[PDB]
Design an enzyme around this catalytic site. Structure first.
Site, short mmCIF file in Angstrom:
data_model
loop_
_atom_site.label_atom_id
_atom_site.label_comp_id
_atom_site.label_asym_id
_atom_site.label_seq_id
_atom_site.Cartn_x
_atom_site.Cartn_y
_atom_site.Cartn_z
N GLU A 239 32.21 42.24 33.58
CA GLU A 239 33.08 41.47 33.40
C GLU A 239 33.87 41.19 32.09
O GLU A 239 34.74 40.27 32.02
CB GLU A 239 32.32 40.19 33.95
CG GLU A 239 31.91 39.85 35.40
CD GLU A 239 33.07 40.14 36.36
OE1 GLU A 239 34.10 39.89 35.98
OE2 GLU A 239 32.58 40.05 37.41
N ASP B 268 42.06 37.01 36.22
CA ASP B 268 41.16 37.98 36.60
C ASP B 268 41.77 39.22 37.54
O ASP B 268 43.33 38.96 37.42
CB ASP B 268 39.95 37.35 37.63
CG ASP B 268 40.39 36.97 38.78
OD1 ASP B 268 41.43 37.13 39.48
OD2 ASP B 268 39.42 36.38 39.63
N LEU C 107 35.18 32.42 37.37
CA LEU C 107 36.36 31.92 38.05
C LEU C 107 36.34 30.46 38.15
O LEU C 107 35.44 29.59 38.35
CB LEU C 107 36.05 32.32 39.64
CG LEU C 107 37.29 31.83 40.70
CD1 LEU C 107 38.45 32.36 40.26
CD2 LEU C 107 36.86 32.45 42.18
N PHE D 285 28.40 38.34 42.68
CA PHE D 285 28.99 37.45 41.55
C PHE D 285 30.48 38.18 41.79
O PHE D 285 31.31 37.21 41.44
CB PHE D 285 28.28 38.41 40.41
CG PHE D 285 28.67 37.56 39.09
CD1 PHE D 285 30.03 37.64 38.59
CD2 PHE D 285 27.96 36.72 38.61
CE1 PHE D 285 30.46 37.20 37.36
CE2 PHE D 285 28.29 36.02 37.22
CZ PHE D 285 29.34 36.14 36.78
N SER E 290 27.48 48.55 55.97
CA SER E 290 26.75 49.04 54.37
C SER E 290 25.36 48.45 54.09
O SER E 290 24.29 49.14 53.80
CB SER E 290 27.68 48.80 53.23
OG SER E 290 28.77 49.30 53.24
N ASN F 181 29.92 54.56 52.87
CA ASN F 181 30.42 53.36 53.68
C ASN F 181 30.98 52.43 52.78
O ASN F 181 31.98 51.59 53.05
CB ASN F 181 29.43 52.92 54.44
CG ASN F 181 29.98 51.78 55.37
OD1 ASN F 181 29.85 50.82 55.17
ND2 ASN F 181 30.67 52.01 56.60
K LIG Z 1 36.36 39.61 34.21
#
Ligand SMILES: [K+]
Ligand SMILES: [Cl-]
Ligand SMILES: [Cl-]
Length: 162
Positions: free
Chosen positions: A11, A20, A32, A104, A117, A132
């Protein structure tokens, strides 16, 4: 390596509001703020989150505080989700971090939609799960990050982050 170091790599860390990968206002270590296109709306969310009028800028300690909260919320979110909890519980500690990373980035609901999955992960069919997982908008939009996460699920090692 641990979940904090892993997500810090994926991140980054920025102390001013930024957009983002999806164009949404964010700050810190991938916190966010809002999906609204209004910068004022994002600044309002920021101030509410920090508890002061920030004018779009925070400190490193504040960023790390939001990050602690966000990781905690992702994990407990997994445990509160009937699709994600059994898979999480079935996994080893390193693969658990891969699942936390996905939540996340995309939220519990989004990850819980990876039904096939998740089943392959529960079955410990690691190469099959990895194939997958890559058949996804997620992989196509953020391939380098998704490849790292997927390698972590395939191998149960930190090789993609070392
Ligand atoms: K970021
Ligand atoms: Cl694809
Ligand atoms: Cl990426």
């Amino acid at each position: 390596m641990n979940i904090f170091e892993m997500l810090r790599i994926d991140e980054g860390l920025r102390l001013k509001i930024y957009k983002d990968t999806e164009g949404y206002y964010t700050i810190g270590i991938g916190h966010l703020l809002t999906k609204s296109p209004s910068l004022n709306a994002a600044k309002s969310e920021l101030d509410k989150a920090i508890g002061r009028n920030c004018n779009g800028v925070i400190t490193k300690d504040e960023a790390e505080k939001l990050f602690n909260q966000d990781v905690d919320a992702a994990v407990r979110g997994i445990l509160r989700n009937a699709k994600l909890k059994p898979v999480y519980d079935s996994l080893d500690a390193v693969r658990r971090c891969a699942l936390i990373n996905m939540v996340f980035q995309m939220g519990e609901t989004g990850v819980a939609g990876f039904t096939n999955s998740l089943r392959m992960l529960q079955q410990k069919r690691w190469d099959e799960a990895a194939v997958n997982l890559a058949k996804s908008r997620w992989y196509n939009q953020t391939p380098n990050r998704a490849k790292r996460v997927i390698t972590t699920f395939r191998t149960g090692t930190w090789d993609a982050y070392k």
